[PDB]
Amino acid sequence: PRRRVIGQRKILPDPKFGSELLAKFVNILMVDGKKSTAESIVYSALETLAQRSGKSELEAFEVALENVRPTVEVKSRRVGGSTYQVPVEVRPVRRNALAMRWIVEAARKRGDKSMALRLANELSDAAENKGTAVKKREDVHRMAEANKAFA
Amino acid sequence: RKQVSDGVAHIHASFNNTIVTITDRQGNALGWATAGGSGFRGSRKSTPFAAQVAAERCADAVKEYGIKNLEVMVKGPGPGRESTIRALNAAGFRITNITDVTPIPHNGCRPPKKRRV
Amino acid sequence: IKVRENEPFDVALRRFKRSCEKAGVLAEVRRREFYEKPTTERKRAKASAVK
RNA sequence: GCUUGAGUCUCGUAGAGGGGGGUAGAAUUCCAGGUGUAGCGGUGAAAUGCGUAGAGAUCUGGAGGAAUACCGGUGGCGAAGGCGGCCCCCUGGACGAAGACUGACGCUCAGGUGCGAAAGCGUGGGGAGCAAACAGGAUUAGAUACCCUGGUAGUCCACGCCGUAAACGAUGUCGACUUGGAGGUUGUGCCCUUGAGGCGUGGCUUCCGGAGCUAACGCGUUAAGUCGACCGCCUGGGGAGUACGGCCGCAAGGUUAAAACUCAAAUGAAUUGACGGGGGCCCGCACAAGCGGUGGAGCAUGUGGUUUAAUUCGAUGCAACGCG
Numbered sequence: 212p213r214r215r216v217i218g219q220r221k222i223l224p225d226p227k228f229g230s231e232l233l234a235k236f237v238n239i240l241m242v243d244g245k246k247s248t249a250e251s252i253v254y255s256a257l258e259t260l261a262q263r264s265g266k267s268e269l270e271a272f273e274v275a276l277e278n279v280r281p282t283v284e285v286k287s288r289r290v291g292g293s294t295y296q297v298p299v300e301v302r303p304v305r306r307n308a309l310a311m312r313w314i315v316e317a318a319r320k321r322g323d324k325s326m327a328l329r330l331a332n333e334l335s336d337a338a339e340n341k342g343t344a345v346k347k348r349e350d351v352h353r354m355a356e357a358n359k360a361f362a
Numbered sequence: 363r364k365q366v367s368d369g370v371a372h373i374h375a376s377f378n379n380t381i382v383t384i385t386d387r388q389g390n391a392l393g394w395a396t397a398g399g400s401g402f403r404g405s406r407k408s409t410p411f412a413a414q415v416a417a418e419r420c421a422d423a424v425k426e427y428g429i430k431n432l433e434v435m436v437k438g439p440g441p442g443r444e445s446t447i448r449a450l451n452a453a454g455f456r457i458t459n460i461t462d463v464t465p466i467p468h469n470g471c472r473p474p475k476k477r478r479v
Numbered sequence: 480i481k482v483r484e485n486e487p488f489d490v491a492l493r494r495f496k497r498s499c500e501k502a503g504v505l506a507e508v509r510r511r512e513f514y515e516k517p518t519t520e521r522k523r524a525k526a527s528a529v530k
Numbered sequence: 531g532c533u534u535g536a537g538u539c540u541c542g543u544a545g546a547g548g549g550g551g552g553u554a555g556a557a558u559u560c561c562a563g564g565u566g567u568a569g570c571g572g573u574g575a576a577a578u579g580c581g582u583a584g585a586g587a588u589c590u591g592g593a594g595g596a597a598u599a600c601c602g603g604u605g606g607c608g609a610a611g612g613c614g615g616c617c618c619c620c621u622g623g624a625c626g627a628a629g630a631c632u633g634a635c636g637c638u639c640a641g642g643u644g645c646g647a648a649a650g651c652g653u654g655g656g657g658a659g660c661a662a663a664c665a666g667g668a669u670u671a672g673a674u675a676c677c678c679u680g681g682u683a684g685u686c687c688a689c690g691c692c693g694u695a696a697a698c699g700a701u702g703u704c705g706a707c708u709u710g711g712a713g714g715u716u717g718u719g720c721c722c723u724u725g726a727g728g729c730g731u732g733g734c735u736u737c738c739g740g741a742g743c744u745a746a747c748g749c750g751u752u753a754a755g756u757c758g759a760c761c762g763c764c765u766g767g768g769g770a771g772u773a774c775g776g777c778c779g780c781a782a783g784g785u786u787a788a789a790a791c792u793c794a795a796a797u798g799a800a801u802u803g804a805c806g807g808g809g810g811c812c813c814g815c816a817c818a819a820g821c822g823g824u825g826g827a828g829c830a831u832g833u834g835g836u837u838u839a840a841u842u843c844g845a846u847g848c849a850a851c852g853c854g
Contacts, residue, residue: 213813243822287818293405293574305819312820360402360411374587378572381587389589390565396586399569404576437587439505447491461481462496464505467557468599468615471659472512472685478676479574504599508557512597512660525604529737 227254230269232307239311240330255327260334271338278340279348280310283355298355298362310344317343366392368431369424371450373417375440380413382420382446384429392427395420397442413442414449421453433459 222238224231233253241249257272264271285296301309318326318333320343336342369392372383383394397412400419406412432455434447451457482493 212818213816291574358406360406360409362411370588372588376571379570379586381570383566383587385565385588388565391588392566394567394587396569398571405574439501444491459481459483460491460493462493462500463480464500465557466500466504466599467508467597468555469597470557470599471559471595471597472661473508473510473558474660475511476677477510499600508599521602522604526737528604 226250228269233257233269233272235308236272236311236315239308239315252326252330255325256331256334259327259331263331263335264338272334275334275337276307276310276314278337279313279344280306281348281351284309284351285354285358295361296354296358298358313344313347317347363426366427366429369427369429370433370435371417371420371447371455372435372437373413373443373446374437375413375442375446376408376438377440378408380408380416380440380442380446382413382417384420384424384432387433392429393420393423395423408441410441410445413440414445416442417446417449418453421450421455429455431456431458433461436460436462437464439464 222231222234225233225237237246237250237253240253257268260271260275261268266274281301283298283300286299288295288297314330314333314337318330321329321333323329323332333342333344337344366386369384369386370389372385374381374383379396379398381394381396383391385391395416397409397416398407400412400415402409402412432450434450434457436443436447447457447460480495482495
């Protein structure tokens with residue numbers, strides 16, 4: 212990244228719904244190279260999400276993830292010998308990457324039984340935008356809203 | 363109240379703070395707003411953003427007068443001033459004149475020493 | 480110093496103050512009376528203006 | 531005696547040359563008043579400070595002091611220090627054009643005399659801004675500083691003193707000769723002035739360079755080149771431009787000016803490198819963007835230490851510490 216501008220590698224889409232978005236979601240959730248376990252958790256959790264909300268699968272996922280995507284985020288500069296937290300507009304791939312990282316991280320924070328219930332309840336708490344990942348999004352937006360004076 | 367319908371926006375941009383005072387053509391102030399009185403104390407009260415929200419807030423608080431035309435008089439240098447007049451024609455004012463009235467001495471008083479920072 | 484315009488106007492476009500007052504003249508009169516640094520600042524300004 | 535040195539006269543030119551007097555416009559501060567309202571100011575961030583007893587902002591009127599934006603220019607003038615609005619008065623010098631006059635009247639100069647930034651001193655005024663001292667706030671390990679908020683002498687005027695500066699082109703004065711180029715500034719002559727031209731001829735000045743010189747760097751017709759006249763000064767570093775004495779000074783101090791002792795160097799310019807909280811360009815899981823660890827727990831293993839009869843020896847920033 213000093214010199215090398217890069218490409219990006221193409222991920223295989225989801226084997227049940229053909230969604231590369233949800234494929235990157237099972238990669239964000241995966242730990243220790245265990246992909247089967249993570250896709251089992253995602254299929255169970257989103258299956259009970261589709262059963263609970265009654266909408267469908269990945270539009271319930273797409274709504275619950277649409278409520279947690281950040282708009283702008285702070286970022287350090289260190290240009291004039293000072294520490295500024297400037298607000299900067301998030302790229303779309305980074306936008307939903309941060310969305311999924313906050314959903315998954317907040318779901319690991321929860322205190323329910325199984326991971327499919329922690330993440331199904333976290334996506335359900337994000338569908339009416341009252342969970343923890345929405346507090347992370349509102350927190351990011353308070354930081355970039357307080358420091359709006361730098362652009 | 364009193365229904366003046368034309369005023370002057372004296373904007374006083376300095377390096378640390380911009381202070382916008384909307385008055386009439388006689389010179390009697392009708393309401394003011396500073397960048398430091400709009401939140402963002404400190405390194406953030408001298409920015410174009412702070413000056414524009416100062417000017418938005420000074421456009422409010424003169425609704426009681428029905429000002430439509432105004433001249434703009436600009437003092438001092440500053441990160442403000444330019445953005446400041448923008449905020450004024452983002453607030454429905456018909457901006458008539460833009461004069462820059464920075465006080466320049468004709469080699470008058472001795473300026474202070476300073477700044478071996 | 481003044482500007483005005485009739486109803487075809489959109490932008491400020493007052494670059495009369497990148498002509499005279501703002502950039503140099505007020506930032507110059509913020510700091511010390513020398514007699515000494517200006518003689519050398521002007522000496523090296525006119526010694527830099529060379530081909 | 532003579533005119534090619536020096537000087538006088540005639541006519542103009544440019545100029546922040548000097549001294550005295552007056553005036554003008556912007557701006558800062560203060561005072562009085564109107565509007566108006568919650569901050570202003572300040573900083574890297576803050577706080578001290580000012581502010582609902584109404585600040586800051588804004589308008590009107592007044593007072594006062596200092597300095598004189600733009601023009602403004604390696605532009606000008608002055609012996610040097612230095613001199614910057616505009617106007618008047620008194621006054622010094624320079625330069626140019628043609629002609630006339632005197633006729634070597636010249637050059638330098640120890641002692642001597644004068645002028646001599648700034649700070650400082652004396653007496654009397656003045657005092658807006660700025661600001662040693664000083665005070666407070668910060669910063670910091672400390673901060674008798676840098677930064678912030680105030681702030682007295684001083685800076686300004688009159689007269690006297692001081693008598694120095696990196697008072698520097700670190701280059702004494704006067705004169706003569708020795709290839710060039712580009713400018714600036716101020717005169718003057720000639721030619722269709724056929725315009726903001728062309729050709730010369732002086733004065734002052736800036737940059738670059740030739741020969742030559744120079745340790746080199748550089749100087750280079752304004753010499754640090756080639757010569758002549760007279761003056762000043764130098765003789766290793768420190769001690770020391772100090773002590774004692776003299777002269778000067780109100781004082782601060784100034785000037786003239788040693789020795790003992792001590793070192794074998796001190797110095798100049800340039801070269802190679804290294805370094806820089808100098809500059810430009812560029813790279814690496816270097817940072818950033820992420821994911822997983824270590825430091826916490828138990829154990830394994832190595833080391834330091836301690837113990838021991840011995841706890842064999844070696845490895846110890848990175849690049850020793852389950853290493854030999």
